[PDB]
Write a protein that holds these residues in place. Structure first.
Motif, PDB file in Angstrom:
ATOM      1  N   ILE A   1       0.831  -1.211   0.000  1.00  0.00           N
ATOM      2  CA  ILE A   1       0.000   0.000   0.000  1.00  0.00           C
ATOM      3  C   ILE A   1       0.866   1.263   0.000  1.00  0.00           C
ATOM      4  O   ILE A   1       2.070   1.185   0.250  1.00  0.00           O
ATOM      5  CB  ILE A   1      -1.026   0.022   1.167  1.00  0.00           C
ATOM      6  CG1 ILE A   1      -0.340   0.232   2.527  1.00  0.00           C
ATOM      7  CG2 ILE A   1      -1.880  -1.239   1.155  1.00  0.00           C
ATOM      8  CD1 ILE A   1      -1.297   0.313   3.706  1.00  0.00           C
TER       9      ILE A   1
ATOM     10  N   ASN B   1       0.210   5.974   0.294  1.00  0.00           N
ATOM     11  CA  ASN B   1      -0.792   7.057   0.412  1.00  0.00           C
ATOM     12  C   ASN B   1      -0.398   8.460  -0.070  1.00  0.00           C
ATOM     13  O   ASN B   1      -0.603   9.443   0.645  1.00  0.00           O
ATOM     14  CB  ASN B   1      -1.405   7.104   1.829  1.00  0.00           C
ATOM     15  CG  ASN B   1      -0.361   7.172   2.928  1.00  0.00           C
ATOM     16  OD1 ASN B   1      -0.371   6.362   3.848  1.00  0.00           O
ATOM     17  ND2 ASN B   1       0.549   8.139   2.834  1.00  0.00           N
TER      18      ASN B   1
ATOM     19  N   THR C   1      -5.121   9.434  -3.799  1.00  0.00           N
ATOM     20  CA  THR C   1      -4.957   9.621  -2.356  1.00  0.00           C
ATOM     21  C   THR C   1      -4.426   8.347  -1.696  1.00  0.00           C
ATOM     22  O   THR C   1      -3.921   8.371  -0.564  1.00  0.00           O
ATOM     23  CB  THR C   1      -6.273  10.075  -1.667  1.00  0.00           C
ATOM     24  OG1 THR C   1      -6.130   9.957  -0.244  1.00  0.00           O
ATOM     25  CG2 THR C   1      -7.478   9.235  -2.112  1.00  0.00           C
ATOM     26  N   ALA C   2      -4.550   7.239  -2.420  1.00  0.00           N
ATOM     27  CA  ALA C   2      -4.128   5.934  -1.942  1.00  0.00           C
ATOM     28  C   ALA C   2      -3.877   5.025  -3.134  1.00  0.00           C
ATOM     29  O   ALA C   2      -4.386   5.283  -4.224  1.00  0.00           O
ATOM     30  CB  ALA C   2      -5.200   5.341  -1.036  1.00  0.00           C
TER      31      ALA C   2
ATOM     32  N   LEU D   1      -6.133   3.502   4.371  1.00  0.00           N
ATOM     33  CA  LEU D   1      -5.443   3.527   3.087  1.00  0.00           C
ATOM     34  C   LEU D   1      -4.947   4.919   2.696  1.00  0.00           C
ATOM     35  O   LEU D   1      -3.880   5.055   2.088  1.00  0.00           O
ATOM     36  CB  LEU D   1      -6.349   2.956   1.998  1.00  0.00           C
ATOM     37  CG  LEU D   1      -5.665   2.260   0.822  1.00  0.00           C
ATOM     38  CD1 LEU D   1      -4.564   1.325   1.304  1.00  0.00           C
ATOM     39  CD2 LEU D   1      -6.688   1.494   0.007  1.00  0.00           C
ATOM     40  N   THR D   2      -5.722   5.942   3.067  1.00  0.00           N
ATOM     41  CA  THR D   2      -5.370   7.346   2.811  1.00  0.00           C
ATOM     42  C   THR D   2      -4.438   7.914   3.882  1.00  0.00           C
ATOM     43  O   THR D   2      -4.187   9.123   3.903  1.00  0.00           O
ATOM     44  CB  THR D   2      -6.616   8.261   2.728  1.00  0.00           C
ATOM     45  OG1 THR D   2      -7.324   8.237   3.975  1.00  0.00           O
ATOM     46  CG2 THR D   2      -7.546   7.829   1.613  1.00  0.00           C
ATOM     47  N   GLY D   3      -3.953   7.050   4.772  1.00  0.00           N
ATOM     48  CA  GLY D   3      -3.011   7.443   5.822  1.00  0.00           C
ATOM     49  C   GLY D   3      -3.668   8.056   7.043  1.00  0.00           C
ATOM     50  O   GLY D   3      -3.007   8.680   7.864  1.00  0.00           O
TER      51      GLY D   3
END
Lengths: 157, 75
Positions: free
Chosen positions: A17, A19, A127-128, B8-10
């Protein structure tokens, strides 16, 4: 290269993953897929084959069936459901059926390419991202997750 | 006991929780606070996805630990 400068966090089994935040149009060219219920697969068909037909997606769905045969039972995402391999295929293979991360994972193992899903904003901003497989993003198949419900295709510029 | 959950976007979530709480339990607490439906959550820690049956101590999750929250991506 910027996209290759991005660091990825492995979290499980070659699933990584990351971000960041940037505008897709800067680094990627977008090839839009129709609102079929097959856009996930169409997106693969656009990047995987030379010439993409409207019926090509069934070749990647063919691959999925072959892939699920031997990978489903060891997929982390699948495990967290309680759905059998057979229970899964008699729904996934039906027409206009959504797909995504589970099938991205399975397919990356099967066609031996690495597949990335870029989550995007209504502001067309990433954004991800989830990467499936150990590849760098340039030699990877890049997909864009548009609403929370749609997939389009991406080519690096 | 406060634990951390990274999306997921931190984005991080702070959560009060007890070691005996199941994974279903923690997911349910995530729904409370962040509006994320359980069936859409992937809870990942130490290099493995957690399973609903087990408790927090069966993955030895303790005190200030940070679990990953990955949304099940469909479309």
């Amino acid at each position: 290269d910027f996209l290759d400068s991005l660091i990825w966090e492995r979290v499980v089994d070659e699933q990584y993953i990351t971000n960041p935040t940037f505008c897709v149009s800067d680094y990627f060219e977008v090839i839009r897929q129709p609102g079929d219920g097959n856009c996930f697969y169409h997106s693969i068909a656009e990047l995987f084959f030379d010439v993409k037909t409207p019926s090509s997606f069934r070749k990647v769905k063919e691959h999925l069936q072959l892939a699920a045969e031997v990978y489903y039972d060891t997929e982390p995402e699948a495990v967290g459901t309680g759905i059998s391999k057979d229970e899964y295929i008699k729904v996934a293979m039906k027409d206009n059926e959504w797909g995504g991360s589970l099938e991205a994972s399975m397919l990356s193992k099967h066609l031996q390419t690495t597949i990335i899903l870029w989550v995007v904003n209504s502001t067309e901003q990433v954004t991800a991202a989830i990467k499936f497989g150990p590849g760098r993003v340039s030699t990877a198949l890049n997909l864009m997750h548009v609403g929370r419900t749609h997939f389009d295709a991406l080519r690096i510029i | 006991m406060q634990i951390f959950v990274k999306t997921l976007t931190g984005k991080t979530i702070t959560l009060e929780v007890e070691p005996s709480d199941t994974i279903e339990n923690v997911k349910a607490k995530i729904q409370d606070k962040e509006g994320i439906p359980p069936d859409q959550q992937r809870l990942i820690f130490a290099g493995k996805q957690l399973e609903d049956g087990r408790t927090l101590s069966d993955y030895n999750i303790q005190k200030e630990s940070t679990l990953h929250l990955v949304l099940r991506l469909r479309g």
